[PDB]
Design a protein around this ligand. Sequence first.
Ligand SMILES: CCCCCCCCCCCCCCCCCC(=O)OC[C@H](COP(=O)(O)OCCN)OC(=O)CCCCCCCCCCCCCCCCC
Ligand SMILES: CCCCCCCCCCCC(=O)OC[C@H](COP(=O)(O)OCC[N+](C)(C)C)OC(=O)CCCCCCCCCCC
Lengths: 137, 192, 149, 155, 183, 80, 506
Amino acid sequence: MLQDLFNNYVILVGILGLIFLGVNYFIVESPRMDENNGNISDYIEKSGPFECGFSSFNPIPIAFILVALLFLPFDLEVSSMLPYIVSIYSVGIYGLIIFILFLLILIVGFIYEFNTKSLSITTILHKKNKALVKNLY
Amino acid sequence: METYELIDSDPKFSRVVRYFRPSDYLTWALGTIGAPGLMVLFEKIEPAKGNTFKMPPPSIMRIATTIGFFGGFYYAYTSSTKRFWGYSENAKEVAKDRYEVKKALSEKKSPYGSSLLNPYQQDMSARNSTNSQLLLAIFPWFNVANHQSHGIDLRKYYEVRDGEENWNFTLPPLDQVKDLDVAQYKEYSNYP
Amino acid sequence: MIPFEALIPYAIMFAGFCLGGGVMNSAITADITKRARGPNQEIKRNVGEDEGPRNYTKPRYNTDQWDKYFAVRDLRLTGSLRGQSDNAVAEESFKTNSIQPYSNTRRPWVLRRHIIMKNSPTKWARKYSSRRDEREQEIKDDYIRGMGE
Amino acid sequence: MNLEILDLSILGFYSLISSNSFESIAILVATIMPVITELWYNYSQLFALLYTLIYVGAVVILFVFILSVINEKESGLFILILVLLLDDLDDNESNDNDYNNVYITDYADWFNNYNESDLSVIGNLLFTEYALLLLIISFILLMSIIGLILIVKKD
Amino acid sequence: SSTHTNDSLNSSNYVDKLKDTHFVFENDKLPSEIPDVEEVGATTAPLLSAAYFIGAKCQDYNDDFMLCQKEAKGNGPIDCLKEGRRVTRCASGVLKDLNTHCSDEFRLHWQCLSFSNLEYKNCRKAESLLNKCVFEKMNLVKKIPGIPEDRQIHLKQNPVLKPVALHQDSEVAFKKAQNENSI
Amino acid sequence: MDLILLMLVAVGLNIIDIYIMIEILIMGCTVNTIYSASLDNDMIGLIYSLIQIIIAGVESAIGLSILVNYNRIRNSEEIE
Amino acid sequence: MLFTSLLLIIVYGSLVNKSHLLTKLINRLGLIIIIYTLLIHLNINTLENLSIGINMFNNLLLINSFNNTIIELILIICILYVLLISFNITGLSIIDNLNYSKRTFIVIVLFNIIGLTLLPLVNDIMILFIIIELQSYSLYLLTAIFNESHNSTKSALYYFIVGSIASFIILDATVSIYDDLGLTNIQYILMYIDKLEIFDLLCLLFGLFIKIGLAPFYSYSITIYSLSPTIITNYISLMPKLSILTLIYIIMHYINIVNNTDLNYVISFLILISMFIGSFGGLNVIRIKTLLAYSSLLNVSYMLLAILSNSNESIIAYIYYIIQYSLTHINIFSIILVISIYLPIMNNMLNVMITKYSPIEYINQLKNLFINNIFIAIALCISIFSLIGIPPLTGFYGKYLVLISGLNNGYVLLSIVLIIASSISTVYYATILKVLSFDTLSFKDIISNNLIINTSPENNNNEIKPEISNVISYVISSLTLIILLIIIQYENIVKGAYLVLLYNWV
Ligand SMILES: CCCCCCCCCCCCCCCCCC(=O)OC[C@H](COP(=O)(O)OCCN)OC(=O)CCCCCCCCCCCCCCCCC
Ligand SMILES: CCCCCCCCCCCC(=O)OC[C@H](COP(=O)(O)OCC[N+](C)(C)C)OC(=O)CCCCCCCCCCC
């Protein structure tokens, strides 16, 4: 299988990257031509954040962290299913039973993280209600 | 060194269960009721909280029975396996094994059973499950395949021992036994 | 009430796929066929008067290792990687043009130039310790030391 | 002009001067890409794509995920080029000169009429021959799922 | 399978640059002690078209050529040089026959293979004509070992997987035989 | 050159920079295995490389989890 | 039985409600699982049959009578450790409830026992790397099981980084071996044991030397052991050495086939250096766990001399030493988990901050234990006297047997240094005995009611109220008399070690 046609494509796309950047740099009118008030550098008002107009100045939930952390074990489970795809016929029943076992052990992990509700954001800080109880004497 | 006759170097899972002695079932029963008892015995030894005996909650006793249900079976499975390997008393199983094989060869069926697994898959399966009971205390692995690498010579099932000729079984030459390595590579030398 | 003004962009996107596909199907087929006509440029371009209808060769996909051996074998017979020929006897140049590629077996550049990847307990001993290389050099020396017998 | 050398010299230049964690994560991506590209050509196209799918797609974007969580706060040109030049001189990883100067070939043969990809053979052996290696791996993956939750989960 | 190797042509010229591949020729012919043979000159498509007729005609020599390789015990290339020429001569015999008996039936079929990605499933109409012609004029038949006669794939009247695009020369030649022969 | 331990100059001054150096170090081991396996036409070396890539991923996840909890442990006032 | 029950415990623990009683009851389910594992193991595995060595699972795992000895030992020591987390170590709810605050504690321990028991059996470089990670990953999780603790998490971060570098060195040695030979199975490598670079197996050892805390790598182990909770340090400072030292012994068995002297000199350089640091290091220390970390390094140095010598007497020296040292280690740490009830309470100067993770942290917190509990003080005295090497305790026979193996192989220099290093280390074992008893007669009649044990409620005032729980007391007493009275059955035990073979045969 030849890939010299593919190589020229990758090279052209690499050339297309330089063209997109520089075409802006050669077609925009000179700062003097428009208003001359300054370049992007000195014009710090124009080169700044957007805060809807008013100038101002990540303790993320642990549930978000466990979403990203648990992505890695579940990704290596999916990527290790790749060898079974292109060899499903020649491993027969034996490799099919092994594959199912390879999935059951990982599912017991899915059960564990489903019961603990690890991914739920939860609301421990707020949403409290109480019963007004009179304390007659 | 207590050595006996090697019935099967890799006994099949279904065979190992069918060869349980009554005492093996007792060990499986004892293991099943031992684990819930061991939880109770600990509480009698020492209460988990407080200073007085308190029966553990029924939920713990159900999970305890399951854990002791596998452990009892594993102990039963390994003890039954030693007989096949020859490490234990296997005179009773040897006659029982010989009756089945001599019957099997007689019907021209394979002693080992027909197999979905091709030649490489049969031999590969044997490698995984041979001597796998030594680590059966760590993780399970059973011979559930009808392979042919059992560490025996099928010639030894032709000679008649004491109390066997009365069976009057006729054994054909192995070359005519269905699903054996000595009866498959007749057309091509690499295809069965 | 079907809006045709709304479907104008789709008819242009339909032409976008057709433009790319129409070119690829025809240009690649024509190039493969032309190079499968003969071993020189004065044959590939011209069509003879006594030649019959032209049989185009479509591009090949889903190949394996035999198609890399078949391609070079076809190259040595016709001058093209997908040439056509069904002569029961090959040319006498077929027996003296086998291409056997010789290439080096050195480790990747990153494995031996990265500021971090090259540092390792055993990679230093390969690079700075003579213990391994002096032992192996003995076997090379004893090759020529045994030609006397 | 083996341009793969110039990519690493730039990479080796920025590894000596990186200050924050943005550049440190950049050295990771700037190292896999030469690893992937030098595997795509030459040695193994299958493991170039496995690296992209498993390293870049899975373990690299996790680094930048936690860098946004952790924090973002806070040499001389002569010594660097002197060090890089000194690092550049001796690049022979092995000292078997004949093994590095003499080329070799292999001879193909037609005995293998059942031609299938490497990933076909790897699956053929991993799911049959070394099914213990495959099963322990799912066991190591299982421990991580439990291991991540016990380390990080608060309550 | 498009794995890089050290034994044939690789995917791209960038592989060659990394490996520093030299494509080396050897002008030296074989020594006169080995009697010469006329190498087969057919390309990929004609061989795949006539493969089952080479199997039908050279079956004894192919088996004997391989049995020499099995029993040479690693010295196969050197100790089977004489048995390897019978196979080359036998296969040249078949291609020479197809050129002098079924030239148009043969060419039509392997033009179809060169038109349909060298796949047998796409060229059944041309292939059926070639098999019928070869049988009457050389007695060779196509047989796929290991299955009953009634269940061979190339005789399947209604295949599940069929070519997407038709070969014009195949469809035209087929219906002509539906008049010449199906009387 | 590396016998003076130059690679210590190339590792940044954060705990996350150490984690990356461990990955780049192990990456060299896998690339070495892929190199040998392809030359020998041996798929057993490719099985090893596949295991090394999968095992090197699990090592990253555990290390980051420890680092993440290490970070929030300081920022654990949460008395708002 | 271990693996199957682990899945049941994983699922069941994630179902039932988070509580201490249920967490403590699940810890008693694991104590059964480990017990069940030992009964099934001993049933099928026998010394008489495993003598030849048996390949399992496509030759990936090879088991013989030397490995089989340690698997049973590992299972035994894991029972004595689980007894701590499964029962009361003090009985005071404040101190003890730490052991029951984590539900995955027993699960991670069960993960490690699978990792520990399979490591000595490995027979393939592909499975060597996988198994060593299974053990290594389980230790990092156990070190960080108390995720609220700042010191515990800081230690697991230090542990993970050092182990990651250690595992990379191990992985790189195997890759280099595969580069030279192209073979993965260890038995196939033995066919080329004369044709490969024997120093690439030494690079493998340098990775395993980091994981056992051997100098110059000793720095991290001392820091880690002095920061983790005493219940955690009781496990991570002993178990890895049980399974790695067995593996190191086997790798050295194969190495001595070619009998390369340069390999032995480098290892002797590390053994010699470690004895120096293991002895002189502990002289100036205040923390008890830092003291037992230097003590651990010295004993590992002794056990490597038996490994390095690697003769027929080296099997006996190693097999005996690894058993007696484990029981001594369990006995000492079990006592330190108990005698925390006698600590005084303030009603000041030096502002010593104590936490519930290490209630006993300084050596002078052992003060006057001869007064508060004389019987347990002698048990700690007997245990320390074994570490010193005073006969006829278990500790003497370990050093005596190690010396036989060392001198029989010509390691004269190392034998003398170990006898110098033993005496230097006696200084800081004697300090523990000085603190235990020497100020008895001045404090004999003192008015003590501010001890931690005096905050225990009075139940009835008529029934007898024992101060220490039942199970922990029986373990301490049993292991103290076994240490003390080994002379009675020593001859049978040693003759029971002559039979443990590693391809000796005939
Ligand atoms: C298609 C091209 C994509 C790359 C475009 C950027 C190219 C610029 C050169 C950087 C890439 C070289 C590879 C080595 C990494 C070096 C990263 C670094 O040190 O910082 C570079 C960038 C600019 O900062 P600089 O002034 O150069 O350094 C001092 C700043 N305090 O500091 C920054 O972080 C600014 C944002 C740059 C983010 C780049 C992300 C890392 C690169 C990944 C994409 C390219 C992958 C590597 C390919 C080449 C490998 C040699
Ligand atoms: C075939 C022989 C089997 C013998 C029995 C073995 C199991 C022990 C349980 C007995 C019942 C029980 O626990 O009874 C309870 C007693 C007494 O407890 P206490 O301290 O007075 O607590 C206070 C009791 N109140 C509540 C009445 C006040 O506990 C014991 O004496 C425990 C003895 C230690 C265990 C011995 C095992 C030795 C292991 C040796 C192998 C290495």
